[PDB]
Design an enzyme around this catalytic site. Structure first.
Site, PDB file in Angstrom:
ATOM      1  N   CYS B 108     -56.652  29.186 -36.490  1.00 34.86           N
ATOM      2  CA  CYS B 108     -57.782  28.228 -36.374  1.00 34.86           C
ATOM      3  C   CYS B 108     -57.349  26.819 -36.662  1.00 34.86           C
ATOM      4  CB  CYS B 108     -58.982  28.597 -37.288  1.00 34.86           C
ATOM      5  SG  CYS B 108     -60.362  27.423 -37.183  1.00 34.86           S
ATOM      6  N   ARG B 111     -59.659  24.142 -39.298  1.00 36.46           N
ATOM      7  CA  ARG B 111     -59.781  24.501 -40.722  1.00 36.46           C
ATOM      8  C   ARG B 111     -59.972  23.344 -41.715  1.00 36.46           C
ATOM      9  NH1 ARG B 111     -54.909  28.378 -41.865  1.00 36.46           N
ATOM     10  NH2 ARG B 111     -54.163  27.409 -39.883  1.00 36.46           N
ATOM     11  N   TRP B 280     -68.098  24.511 -33.886  1.00 36.55           N
ATOM     12  CA  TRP B 280     -68.340  23.772 -32.633  1.00 36.55           C
ATOM     13  C   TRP B 280     -67.061  23.816 -31.795  1.00 36.55           C
ATOM     14  CZ3 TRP B 280     -68.816  21.349 -37.483  1.00 36.55           C
ATOM     15  CH2 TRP B 280     -67.703  20.568 -37.881  1.00 36.55           C
ATOM     16  N   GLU B 285     -61.351  24.578 -24.970  1.00 40.39           N
ATOM     17  CA  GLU B 285     -61.774  25.982 -24.941  1.00 40.39           C
ATOM     18  C   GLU B 285     -62.645  26.225 -23.709  1.00 40.39           C
ATOM     19  OE1 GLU B 285     -62.639  27.768 -28.922  1.00 40.39           O
ATOM     20  OE2 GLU B 285     -63.062  25.667 -29.427  1.00 40.39           O
TER      21      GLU B 285
HETATM   22  C1  HEM Z   1     -65.867  23.943 -37.039  1.00 37.78           C
HETATM   23  C2  HEM Z   1     -65.203  23.778 -35.900  1.00 37.78           C
HETATM   24  C3  HEM Z   1     -64.161  24.799 -35.384  1.00 37.78           C
HETATM   25  C4  HEM Z   1     -63.279  24.533 -34.415  1.00 37.78           C
HETATM   26  C5  HEM Z   1     -63.117  23.204 -33.625  1.00 37.78           C
HETATM   27  C6  HEM Z   1     -62.481  25.723 -34.211  1.00 37.78           C
HETATM   28  C7  HEM Z   1     -61.494  25.847 -33.268  1.00 37.78           C
HETATM   29  C8  HEM Z   1     -60.808  27.000 -32.985  1.00 37.78           C
HETATM   30  C9  HEM Z   1     -59.897  27.211 -31.887  1.00 37.78           C
HETATM   31  C10 HEM Z   1     -59.580  26.101 -30.829  1.00 37.78           C
HETATM   32  C11 HEM Z   1     -59.401  28.463 -32.022  1.00 37.78           C
HETATM   33  C12 HEM Z   1     -58.386  29.263 -31.170  1.00 37.78           C
HETATM   34  C13 HEM Z   1     -57.546  28.394 -30.218  1.00 37.78           C
HETATM   35  C14 HEM Z   1     -58.275  28.215 -28.892  1.00 37.78           C
HETATM   36  O1  HEM Z   1     -59.349  28.835 -28.733  1.00 37.78           O
HETATM   37  O2  HEM Z   1     -57.786  27.458 -27.997  1.00 37.78           O
HETATM   38  C15 HEM Z   1     -60.013  29.063 -33.181  1.00 37.78           C
HETATM   39  C16 HEM Z   1     -59.788  30.355 -33.635  1.00 37.78           C
HETATM   40  C17 HEM Z   1     -60.353  30.945 -34.739  1.00 37.78           C
HETATM   41  N1  HEM Z   1     -61.298  30.376 -35.597  1.00 37.78           N
HETATM   42 FE1  HEM Z   1     -61.860  28.395 -35.632  1.00 37.78          FE
HETATM   43  N2  HEM Z   1     -62.899  26.707 -35.105  1.00 37.78           N
HETATM   44  C18 HEM Z   1     -63.948  26.171 -35.843  1.00 37.78           C
HETATM   45  C19 HEM Z   1     -64.679  26.841 -36.822  1.00 37.78           C
HETATM   46  C20 HEM Z   1     -64.430  28.097 -37.331  1.00 37.78           C
HETATM   47  C21 HEM Z   1     -65.225  28.846 -38.286  1.00 37.78           C
HETATM   48  C22 HEM Z   1     -66.545  28.356 -38.936  1.00 37.78           C
HETATM   49  C23 HEM Z   1     -64.605  30.006 -38.500  1.00 37.78           C
HETATM   50  C24 HEM Z   1     -65.000  31.167 -39.421  1.00 37.78           C
HETATM   51  C25 HEM Z   1     -65.581  30.926 -40.598  1.00 37.78           C
HETATM   52  C26 HEM Z   1     -63.440  30.041 -37.649  1.00 37.78           C
HETATM   53  C27 HEM Z   1     -62.519  31.061 -37.596  1.00 37.78           C
HETATM   54  C28 HEM Z   1     -61.608  31.274 -36.602  1.00 37.78           C
HETATM   55  C29 HEM Z   1     -60.885  32.506 -36.413  1.00 37.78           C
HETATM   56  C30 HEM Z   1     -60.864  33.791 -37.297  1.00 37.78           C
HETATM   57  C31 HEM Z   1     -60.022  32.262 -35.205  1.00 37.78           C
HETATM   58  C32 HEM Z   1     -59.033  33.287 -34.596  1.00 37.78           C
HETATM   59  C33 HEM Z   1     -59.832  34.079 -33.561  1.00 37.78           C
HETATM   60  C34 HEM Z   1     -58.998  35.209 -32.973  1.00 37.78           C
HETATM   61  O3  HEM Z   1     -57.947  35.593 -33.557  1.00 37.78           O
HETATM   62  O4  HEM Z   1     -59.381  35.756 -31.902  1.00 37.78           O
HETATM   63  N3  HEM Z   1     -63.374  28.872 -36.946  1.00 37.78           N
HETATM   64  N4  HEM Z   1     -60.857  28.151 -33.736  1.00 37.78           N
HETATM   65  C1  XFN Z   2     -65.668  30.033 -34.685  1.00 42.63           C
HETATM   66  C2  XFN Z   2     -64.902  29.490 -33.504  1.00 42.63           C
HETATM   67  C3  XFN Z   2     -65.095  28.178 -33.100  1.00 42.63           C
HETATM   68  C4  XFN Z   2     -64.373  27.683 -32.003  1.00 42.63           C
HETATM   69  N1  XFN Z   2     -64.573  26.408 -31.592  1.00 42.63           N
HETATM   70  N2  XFN Z   2     -63.513  28.488 -31.345  1.00 42.63           N
HETATM   71  C5  XFN Z   2     -63.288  29.784 -31.742  1.00 42.63           C
HETATM   72  C6  XFN Z   2     -62.290  30.674 -31.016  1.00 42.63           C
HETATM   73  C7  XFN Z   2     -62.995  31.358 -29.856  1.00 42.63           C
HETATM   74  C8  XFN Z   2     -62.103  32.132 -28.883  1.00 42.63           C
HETATM   75  C9  XFN Z   2     -62.737  33.085 -28.070  1.00 42.63           C
HETATM   76  C10 XFN Z   2     -62.017  33.826 -27.132  1.00 42.63           C
HETATM   77  N3  XFN Z   2     -62.665  34.717 -26.363  1.00 42.63           N
HETATM   78  C11 XFN Z   2     -60.628  33.641 -26.987  1.00 42.63           C
HETATM   79  C12 XFN Z   2     -59.980  32.681 -27.792  1.00 42.63           C
HETATM   80  C13 XFN Z   2     -58.483  32.434 -27.662  1.00 42.63           C
HETATM   81  C14 XFN Z   2     -57.826  33.475 -26.747  1.00 42.63           C
HETATM   82  C15 XFN Z   2     -56.329  33.380 -26.571  1.00 42.63           C
HETATM   83  C16 XFN Z   2     -55.553  32.355 -27.137  1.00 42.63           C
HETATM   84  C17 XFN Z   2     -54.185  32.356 -26.907  1.00 42.63           C
HETATM   85  C18 XFN Z   2     -53.291  31.284 -27.485  1.00 42.63           C
HETATM   86  C19 XFN Z   2     -53.599  33.358 -26.141  1.00 42.63           C
HETATM   87  C20 XFN Z   2     -54.398  34.362 -25.597  1.00 42.63           C
HETATM   88  N4  XFN Z   2     -53.829  35.350 -24.850  1.00 42.63           N
HETATM   89  N5  XFN Z   2     -55.741  34.345 -25.825  1.00 42.63           N
HETATM   90  C21 XFN Z   2     -60.716  31.932 -28.730  1.00 42.63           C
HETATM   91  C22 XFN Z   2     -63.984  30.311 -32.829  1.00 42.63           C
HETATM   92 CL    CL Z   3     -65.275  30.669 -25.882  1.00 42.49          CL
END
Ligand code: HEM
Ligand code: XFN
Ligand code: CL
Ligand code: HEM
Ligand code: XFN
Ligand code: CL
Ligand code: CL
Ligand code: CL
Ligand code: ZN
Ligand code: ZN
Ligand code: ZN
Lengths: 407, 411
Positions: B108, B111, B280, B285
């Site tokens: 993430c 963070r 957000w 994304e």
């Molecule tokens: C507040 C603004 C936030 C932003 C901008 C953000 C952004 C992102 C992005 C960009 C990714 C994955 C990389 C991608 O999708 O390209 C990600 C993954 C993740 N985020 Fe954040 N996030 C936010 C909030 C949070 C919150 C509130 C949580 C949980 C409390 C969280 C937990 C996670 C987790 C666990 C992943 C890994 C998901 C996975 O392994 O499939 N995020 N986030």
């Molecule tokens: C809470 C929160 C907020 C926020 N703004 N964004 C997220 C993550 C959401 C998310 C959703 C999906 N379905 C897939 C990915 C990465 C899927 C992926 C990434 C990479 C690097 C490789 C791969 N094969 N797939 C990220 C969570």
């Molecule tokens: Cl999404």
């Protein structure tokens, strides 16, 4: 023991069995992944020799043959008596090709078997080294129709008679710290340039000065040589639509030729082994031109484009990046100098990887380096799972010789 | 052990000591790195150490380590585990735990925001109707008429594994996908399988390109039930471009609230199988992944056509040109409608600042480079040249199997 990799775009799943032949360490443990870290005796030698010779003989379908067993004995005998051994030409060629085949960070490996190997193990002096290198440069360049090549100088003996090319690439631009405080030319080459000057080079002090070769033979002090300017093919950079682009005065060289790595074949260490291919466009347009510690031209380009640079969210940096990369490819293509764009290169790689999984049981790949430094997600490697592991023969990093060298 | 990371743009070197607290496995070994692999009913015996580790961390954090309150809490949890086989978290512990799971989320980039998470304690929930109501409140609160606020809603923990709370949706808000007889897909291809389940469960599908899915909610191991999120609670942004007036006519829009609902939250050894959390969007994304992945809305070709790019050869970089324009459009649209969004330059710059602060105050910041580096323009963001160390800290968010694979149907 059988490892699966999935493609998240196509759902295709592949099985790796080749990793069971992995040998060196990755840097990772069960507790910590070091995947994004850039650098994470006669007794030792025979096993390594045997491992290599076994794979060689298997490759020519003569595993367990008399010729196989005789060769193993010959090498055993040679190590026992001499403490080292000499590779047959056939073994040298196979080894070098396989070190490329095994380079998990190289997207260009579909080409691995077409490598031209120049055996320079008879070389004895720095002037000899210079001649071999000029020949490699001219052969590889081939008037812009580039051909992959490697030139292999003599192997390490006691580590006090090493051959080294002190340059990181055969062809690269000088870097100069100015009274100003800024840097003229390539900041990556500041230290090496100073050494050239301190060893005697008369630096032109310009933006794109092809560096001289600093060559070390037989553990002797390195010597300076200028590559014949007519052997260094360069391309002025222009844009097919922006007429002001040429005014930035940008150029780059056509031949990427890594010269600071070590080649390991069957336990033997080739400390001087320059190898070259051709460029993927992003290497010049993203890394060399746009990195902040490199030529760092993004801001200047964005300015000429008249983009809104007030806020990052206008994506001005991204627009300027694309245009710079269009310009690189256009310029090379117009001058008929081999170059490959990142879509074409990664598509070829995915094809190569599938061939390798079916014919060889796997293809070690380092995703961090295989995914291009722009537009990652819209290339077919982004969504491809990869397994990274070390196979020999291999190319390895080695320390810069000015730290090591006893003067 | 001290581990160093280098930044190849700045030469700044940081030292990681936090890795010494690492627990679970990476999937990697000394022979094989699985850094790019996407996915590489507890006993009393395993539980108390896990509980203790957590409570020690929590009590250090409040500067009450070794206090009477600390010791009494350990004894109270120990006995509860002895007599009931599990234990209940205090609200403060649950809040701390949930915030730390985010702080520890190595994939993430968002963070920097970790300490500002609104935690909704739904552990008193008993039914799917109750779940629906909690989830509506979460959506309304987090959406905040476009001024998005981070939040998590935490349903009752796992007990025997036969009474799990699950949100069957992968995100609270997501668009339906419909596989046509001709093999094309209407709407979002990522959600075809879940859409079929909804339909099977009784959902009347509008069969359009952007149909908000109903919630499919499971309480206490019962069969899941369907619920429609009130339309007025679903904030959406029509996508247009600041200079290209035909962009709007592509018919694109996206929802403002990214809300992951399919992950498991582990705190002190306890498992929260329904813990939807939201923040957000970062623009890429939507613009890169959701719009331009081939297995998603796949709009690159259509957009490049309208831009009249030379599409005869990849070397015109037509794909890259269209990608940038689509992403400009997503950011422009969200910003124009005053709906929170972050661009990838801003998000990665903030993350590097966060990361360095974490090294200084905490001794580390586990990070997964494959995920932290944005899916476009990687190298010109400050995370590309940053060495990272990936390792697993608890509390944590984890993947879990999709519930249709494991659920025992009651009928
Ligand atoms: C507040 C603004 C936030 C932003 C901008 C953000 C952004 C992102 C992005 C960009 C990714 C994955 C990389 C991608 O999708 O390209 C990600 C993954 C993740 N985020 Fe954040 N996030 C936010 C909030 C949070 C919150 C509130 C949580 C949980 C409390 C969280 C937990 C996670 C987790 C666990 C992943 C890994 C998901 C996975 O392994 O499939 N995020 N986030
Ligand atoms: C809470 C929160 C907020 C926020 N703004 N964004 C997220 C993550 C959401 C998310 C959703 C999906 N379905 C897939 C990915 C990465 C899927 C992926 C990434 C990479 C690097 C490789 C791969 N094969 N797939 C990220 C969570
Ligand atoms: Cl999404
Ligand atoms: C023929 C065309 C070739 C292409 C297009 C190519 C492409 C690339 C690229 C793009 C990278 C690094 C990632 C990046 O810069 O974005 C790389 C790395 C590498 N290449 Fe290739 N290459 C080619 C030929 C070769 C040859 C001929 C060899 C050796 C015989 C080789 C060996 C390596 C090695 C060892 C690395 C990793 C270098 C390091 O760790 O710093 N390549 N290649
Ligand atoms: C033979 C050959 C042909 C060809 N076309 N290209 C090469 C590679 C040359 C190369 C040279 C340098 N200085 C740096 C890198 C990436 C350095 C890098 C990459 C990543 C992904 C991160 C990081 N920090 N640094 C690659 C070799
Ligand atoms: Cl280069
Ligand atoms: Cl780089
Ligand atoms: Cl993805
Ligand atoms: Zn690893
Ligand atoms: Zn770079
Ligand atoms: Zn994707």
């Amino acid at each position: 023991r059988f490892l699966k990799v999935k493609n998240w775009e196509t759902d295709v799943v592949l099985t790796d069995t080749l990793h069971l032949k992995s040998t060196l360490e990755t840097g990772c443990t069960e507790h910590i992944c070091m995947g994004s870290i850039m650098l994470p005796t006669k007794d030792q030698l025979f096993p390594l020799a045997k491992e290599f010779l076994d794979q060689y003989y298997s490759s020519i379908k003569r595993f367990g043959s008399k010729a196989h067993m005789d060769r193993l004995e010959e090498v055993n005998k040679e190590i026992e008596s001499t403490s080292t051994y000499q590779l047959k030409d056939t073994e040298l060629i196979y080894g070098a090709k396989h070190a490329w085949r095994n380079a998990s960070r190289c997207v260009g490996r579909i080409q691995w078997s077409k490598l031209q190997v120049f055996d320079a193990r008879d070389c004895t002096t720095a002037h000899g080294m210079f001649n071999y290198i000029c020949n490699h440069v001219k052969y590889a360049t081939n008037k812009g129709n580039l051909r992959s090549a490697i030139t292999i100088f003599p192997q390490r003996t006691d580590g006090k008679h090493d051959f080294r090319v002190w340059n990181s690439q055969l062809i690269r631009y000088a870097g100069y710290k100015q009274p100003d405080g800024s840097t003229l030319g390539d900041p990556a080459n500041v230290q090496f340039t100073e050494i050239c000057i301190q060893q005697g080079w008369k630096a032109p002090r310009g933006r794109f000065d092809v560096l001289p070769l600093l060559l070390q033979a037989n553990g002797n002090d390195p010597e300076l040589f200028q590559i014949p300017p007519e052997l260094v093919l360069e391309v002025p950079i222009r844009h097919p639509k922006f007429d002001w682009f040429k005014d930035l005065g940008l150029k780059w060289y056509g031949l990427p030729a890594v010269s600071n790595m070590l080649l390991e074949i069957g336990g033997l260490e080739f400390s001087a082994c320059p190898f070259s291919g051709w460029y993927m466009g992003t290497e010049i347009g993203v890394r060399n031109y746009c990195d902040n510690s490199r030529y760092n031209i993004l801001e200047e380009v964005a300015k000429k484009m008249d983009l809104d640079m007030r806020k990052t969210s206008s994506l001005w940096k991204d627009q300027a990046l694309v245009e710079i990369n269009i310009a690189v490819l256009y310029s090379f293509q117009s001058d008929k100098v081999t170059i490959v764009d990142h879509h074409s290169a990664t598509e070829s790689f995915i094809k190569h990887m599938e061939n390798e999984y079916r014919c060889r049981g796997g293809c070690p790949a380092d995703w961090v380096w295989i995914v291009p430094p722009m537009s990652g997600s819209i290339t077919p490697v982004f969504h491809q799972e990869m397994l990274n592991y070390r196979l020999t023969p291999s190319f390895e990093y080695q320390p810069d010789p000015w730290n090591t060298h006893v003067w």
